[PDB]
Write a protein that binds this ligand. Structure first.
Ligand SMILES: *[C@@H]1O[C@H](CO)[C@@H](O[C@@H]2O[C@H](CO)[C@@H](O)[C@H](O)[C@H]2NC(C)=O)[C@H](O)[C@H]1NC(C)=O
Ligand SMILES: *[C@@H]1O[C@H](CO)[C@@H](O)[C@H](O)[C@H]1NC(C)=O
Length: 208
């Protein structure tokens, strides 16, 4: 569990240090900063933030951690397309706040990620239509996508979801009627401000 983690460290970091993720030491000894471990034995989360990570994530390295469940890479400089996080089958928490990931996410990106409870993609530069499969996750509880450049209509949310309690789509450029699959729910903190073109809604604008 040491060599793949330091494959992942060896991309591009511009602010701060390892320090350290030594290749010949166990990452659950308690010295490895920013690592979480199930039961003091195996790696289950990566939590590294504000290091100016400017390189590229190679998810084949992260696939060699079989019980990794949480990734939190908030406030770095990661850019390019969104890496294929769907290749990690047990992933529960994907936190990539304030990075610079760009481009359109494949609509089928979340077809085979039923374990995801939390997806924070806010304040990147993602574009082009929220993937419909994201809104088909029955177990998605927290989805924060504010501050991107998403366009098009919001996909409907499946009735199979009974746990979504926080949805933030503010400050994008979304268009259609806000789906009543979302707005009817009485336990859902939802946010849609700063989305001109958007109507229906908890917002006070018809639609039409
Ligand atoms: C994403 O970036 C913003 C900008 O820094 C963070 O929001 C600010 O957070 C500071 C705390 O350091 C607050 O004092 C400001 O009021 C916040 N400003 C705004 C406009 O929200 C935000 O927390 C970052 N997201 C994460 C997860 O760290
Ligand atoms: C990583 O850094 C090296 C030099 O430090 C550079 O050649 C390479 O292009 C960088 N890659 C990314 C994705 O920033």
């Amino acid at each position: 569990s040491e060599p793949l983690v330091r494959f992942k460290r060896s991309v591009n970091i511009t602010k701060g240090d390892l320090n350290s993720w030594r290749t010949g030491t166990d990452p659950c000894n308690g010295k490895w900063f920013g690592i979480y471990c199930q039961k003091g034995q195996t790696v289950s989360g990566i939590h590294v933030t504000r290091l100016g990570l400017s390189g590229t994530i190679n998810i084949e390295d992260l696939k060699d951690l079989p019980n990794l469940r949480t990734i939190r890479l908030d406030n770095n400089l990661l850019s390019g397309p969104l890496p294929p996080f769907f290749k990690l089958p047990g992933l529960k928490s994907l936190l990539l706040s304030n990075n610079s990931f760009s481009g359109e996410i494949a609509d089928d990106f979340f077809k085979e990620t039923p374990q995801l409870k939390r997806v924070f993609l806010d304040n990147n530069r993602l574009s082009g239509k929220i993937p419909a499969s994201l809104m088909q996750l029955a177990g998605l509880e927290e989805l924060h996508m504010q501050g991107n450049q998403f366009t098009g209509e919001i996909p409907p949310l499946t009735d199979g979801n009974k746990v979504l309690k926080s949805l933030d789509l503010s400050n994008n450029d979304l268009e259609g009627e806000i789906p009543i699959t979302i707005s009817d729910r009485k336990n859902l903190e939802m946010k849609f401000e700063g989305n001109q073109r958007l109507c229906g809604s908890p917002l006070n604008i018809e639609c039409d």
